[PDB]
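Operator note (shift B, R.M.): manual run for Chitinase requested after the automated queue skipped it. Running by hand, logging everything below so the morning shift can see what happened. Input copied straight from the record, untouched. If output looks odd, do not overwrite the archive copy; leave it for review.
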Amino acid sequence: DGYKIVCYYTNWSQYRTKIGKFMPEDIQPELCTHIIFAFGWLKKGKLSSFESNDETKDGKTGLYDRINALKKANPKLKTLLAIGGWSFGTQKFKEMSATRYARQTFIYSAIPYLRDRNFDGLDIDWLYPKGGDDKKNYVLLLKELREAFEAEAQEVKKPRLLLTAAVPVGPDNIKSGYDVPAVASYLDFINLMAYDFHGKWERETGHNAPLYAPSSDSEWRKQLSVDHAAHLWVKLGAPKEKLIIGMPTYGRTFTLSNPNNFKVNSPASGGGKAGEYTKESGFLAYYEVCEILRNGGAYVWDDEMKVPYAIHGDQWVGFDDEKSIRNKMRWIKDNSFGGAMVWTVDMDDFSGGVCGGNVKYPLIGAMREELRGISRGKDAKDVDWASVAAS
Ligand SMILES: CC(=O)N[C@@H]1[C@@H](O)[C@H](O[C@@H]2O[C@H](CO)[C@@H](O[C@@H]3O[C@H](CO)[C@@H](O[C@@H]4O[C@H](CO)[C@@H](O[C@@H]5O[C@H](CO)[C@@H](O[C@@H]6O[C@H](CO)[C@@H](O)[C@H](O)[C@H]6NC(C)=O)[C@H](O)[C@H]5NC(C)=O)[C@H](O)[C@H]4NC(C)=O)[C@H](O)[C@H]3NC(C)=O)[C@H](O)[C@H]2NC(C)=O)[C@@H](CO)O[C@H]1O
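Run finished. Output pasted below as returned.
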């Protein structure tokens, strides 16, 4: 194939208002190599629909089909259905993976659920397995998924269902839940969630996803970087080419205790203000940060972490822009990784009119440029935030 651009689509972006309202049709069919639908759900231990909107029933197409319709314009595109995520909790996953009967019950529900809806594979987003029991059962679930997927592919003579998983970057989390060598052997590839290294759960300011940890940081702290985390999965037994490194189209926000101290690892009095469209304190969509910059926000590039943050009053945002991204893509190329994962496709300037470069998908578009050599076309150019906004 080459390098992968795996984009996560979220079915709750449909509920956003004005510039943030996102429908599947807002995805260019050749933007990504894989689209992962977030999320499916679990019910009675079986793969089920999150809510009716995703399913098509009344002769009105649901979100599943509206997504998978993208494969008509681009046959080479692959779609997966992801189950889990944060809001899903762990308890249901523990119970599903507990016994072989519990697992197989899930597995044999999943395969027809996926085929009947024209999905090409399955993404397991259990956050996270924890303890020695989960560590074993997590592996068992992946193994038995792989086995069955394989068997089915041969019986029905179709290309095999893909099996993937989103996995964490917190060293603690990893050690405690993931038999990495085996976990990787059964997955087709690995979505490394190289983000949420820092957030409103901390009394300090920190970047959502630095490539390298600052000098300001503590040595134990220094472990928190996209570079350390990724190399840590290779060290534990993961194949380089199965690692798809996560890239955030969102930023984690803070409120400065004192707006005069706006440097990274400054004291913060809690999370930053909610975005107007995302409506959740502690983060903003990249297009929501563009608005801040284009309305008096100051921009700062941290040449240590190779990522930027922005400030407006006592509001502090760590994010990724085209400069931050590209540098990362080169990093991927350099370390020979599988490609890029993107959380999310719906929080990039998908419309083209917000950040101001008049280019749809400036970020993921730049990932596809660097990794797969496909121009954003025309004369589109990175917005040069430095000059554009105050310091
Ligand atoms: C005690 C202490 O100090 N502990 C520290 C420890 O916490 C630190 O470690 C860090 O911890 C934090 C939280 O404790 C971790 O944060 C979680 O990180 C995971 C990834 O590992 C995130 O999950 C994936 O990433 C995306 C991005 O967040 C997730 O997207 C979220 O998904 C949820 C639901 O799935 C969305 O909820 C939706 O909210 C909207 C808005 O209101 C609502 O309308 C929707 O209805 C609702 N969803 C539904 C289904 O209804 C949420 O919006 C979205 N976030 C977005 C879009 O920005 C997604 O779940 C995961 N992706 C895939 C793929 O599965 C998780 O979100 C995140 N949680 C929180 C609360 O932040 C962090 O990962 C962890 N990092 C590290 C490095 O450890 C450590 C380090 O400082 O120190 C300890 O001391």
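Quick read of the result: The domain at 4-248+321-388 is CATH 3.20.20.80 (TIM Barrel). Residues 213 and 222 are 5 Å apart (CA to CA).
Leaving this for review. - R.M.
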